[PDB]
C-alpha cells in the first residue's frame, strides 16, 4: 500500500471522490461543518489522524484520560494531548501498510465521538 492509495481507499470508504493532500501529504475532512480531522504521513511507515477538540472541562478529565493512556495491542487507539490553551488534541498513529480505509474511517468516527464525549470494506 502507499500513503496516497490508502487515502484513495479511505475516500471510497467514506463516499468522497478524493481526499486532497498538500505538498507534504497533509489532508483533511470537515465533519458537520465544524470539526476537522487531519491526516498526514509522519515518517516513512506511519501516518496520523488528529483533531482539535474543546477546552478541558476540569481536573476530573485529566485523570480519566491518563488512567486510559496505557499501551495497547490494538491499532487505531485514540490518544489525547493538551495544547497550549488547554484544548484537547485527539489523535491516532497508524502504520500505512497495516491499516485499511475501513479502519481509518473507524478512527475518524472515534475521534469525533471522543470530541463529543469530552480491498472491500470490512465495516
Amino acid at each position: 500500500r502507499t500513503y496516497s492509495s490508502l487515502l484513495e481507499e479511505f475516500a471510497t470508504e467514506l463516499g468522497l471522490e478524493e481526499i486532497e493532500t498538500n505538498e507534504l501529504g497533509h489532508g483533511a475532512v470537515t465533519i458537520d461543518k465544524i470539526w476537522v480531522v487531519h491526516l498526514a504521513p509522519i515518517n516513512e511507515k506511519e501516518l496520523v489522524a488528529f483533531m482539535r477538540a474543546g477546552i478541558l472541562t476540569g481536573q476530573s478529565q485529566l485523570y480519566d484520560i491518563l488512567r486510559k493512556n496505557l499501551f495497547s495491542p490494538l491499532s487505531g487507539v485514540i490518544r489525547c494531548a493538551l495544547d497550549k490553551d488547554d484544548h484537547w488534541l485527539l489523535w491516532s498513529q497508524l502504520n500505512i501498510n497495516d491499516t485499511s480505509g475501513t479502519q481509518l474511517a473507524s478512527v475518524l468516527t472515534s475521534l469525533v465521538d471522543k470530541a463529543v464525549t469530552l480491498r472491500p470494506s470490512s465495516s
Binding site: 475532512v29 465533519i31 487531519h38 488528529f50
Partner: peptide, 28 residues
C-alpha cells in the same frame, strides 16, 4: 460532501485549521 454513519463529511478544511495542523506537525 456526503453523509457517513450520521455525519456530514467533505474533503477540505478552513484555512486556520490547516494552519493549526501545520503547526502541530512541524513541532513533532
Amino acid at each position: 460532501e456526503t453523509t457517513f454513519q450520521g455525519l456530514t463529511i467533505a474533503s477540505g478544511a478552513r484555512e486556520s485549521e490547516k494552519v493549526f495542523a501545520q503547526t502541530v506537525l512541524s513541532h513533532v
